[PDB]
């Protein structure tokens, strides 16, 4: 029985309160099919854990993996709300820390594959290929990652990413982006949803984040726009400990799902509409 850790991140993982009787409301996808939901425990400062409802692209993927590899699971939301970075001694936070400490056995989330994490855990082959882009409020004019308001920044134009995410580390690690990283360090947000809302409320001027998320937000909210294309390619993989007996069949199943159209179906169901 596998302990799955995930994180709130639409459209990959929706998190909704349970009904008064502890069950999850019956809903239907854009195609008319029922939405498969799982009970996931997590916090709402103390972390009071309560049962909640989880669904979306990553939950559909988990259900597929569980059905095809014959394992049972319990899902919970990462206690500290973070994706996972390594901060004398060094420590992993977020889902990475939970997987390494045994609080989880598998990470099923939009978890970016990078060298830092791969040193410590095993990634599947990517279940989603995407990249980094920039989200702004409609009317804001920036060309992209090379815009002067990003490369020669001031307090007149504020931009940020999510703390303790792969994107934060992307900017920390490259000296060519040090001017940006030092600006963003003062303004990074605790979660992507808070950053998106801050862009909507004109309190954050540009949000640098995963294109699969940003492009979905822009497709739903017409006052939000992305700056165009990707300045960096990245991908999400399933995360497991290096000694996991499940790792090779997980990766084979991901490849089979790309190849037989299952991932494309998820993409149409959850991502593009």
């Amino acid at each position: 029985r596998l302990k799955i850790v995930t994180i709130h991140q639409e459209p990959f993982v929706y998190v909704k309160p349970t009904l008064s009787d502890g069950t999850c409301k019956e809903e239907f996808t854009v195609n008319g099919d029922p939405v498969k939901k799982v009970i996931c425990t997590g916090p709402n400062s103390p972390r009071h854990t309560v049962p909640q409802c989880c669904y979306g692209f990553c939950i559909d993927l988990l259900i597929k993996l569980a059905r095809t590899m014959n394992f049972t699971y319990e899902v919970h939301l990462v206690a500290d709300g973070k994706f996972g970075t390594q901060e004398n001694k060094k420590e992993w936070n977020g889902m990475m820390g939970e997987l390494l400490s045994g609080q989880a056995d598998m990470i099923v989330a939009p978890l970016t594959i990078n060298n830092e994490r791969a040193q410590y855990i095993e990634f599947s082959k990517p279940f989603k290929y995407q990249g980094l882009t920039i989200l702004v409020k409609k009317g804001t004019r920036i060309t992209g990652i090379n815009d002067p308001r990003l490369r020669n920044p001031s307090d007149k134009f504020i931009y940020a990413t999510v703390k303790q995410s792969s994107v934060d580390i992307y900017f920390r690690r490259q000296v060519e982006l040090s001017t940006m990283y030092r600006h963003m360090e003062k303004h990074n947000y605790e979660s992507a949803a808070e950053a998106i809302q801050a862009v909507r409320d004109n309190k954050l001027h540009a949000f640098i984040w995963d294109s699969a998320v940003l492009e979905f937000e822009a497709s739903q909210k017409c006052d939000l726009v992305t700056t165009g294309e990707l300045f960096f390619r990245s991908g999400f993989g399933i995360g497991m400990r290096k000694d996991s007996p499940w790792k090779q069949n997980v990766s084979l199943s991901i490849l089979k799902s790309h190849e037989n159209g299952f991932m494309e179906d998820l993409d149409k169901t959850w991502v593009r509409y």
């Binding site: 082959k125 084979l252 490849l255």
Partner: peptide, 15 residues
């Protein structure tokens, strides 16, 4: 190209 049937007989690096 990385695909399932090849991965059954060889290991692949990250793409």
């Amino acid at each position: 190209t990385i695909n399932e049937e090849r991965s059954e007989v060889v290991d692949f690096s990250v793409p």
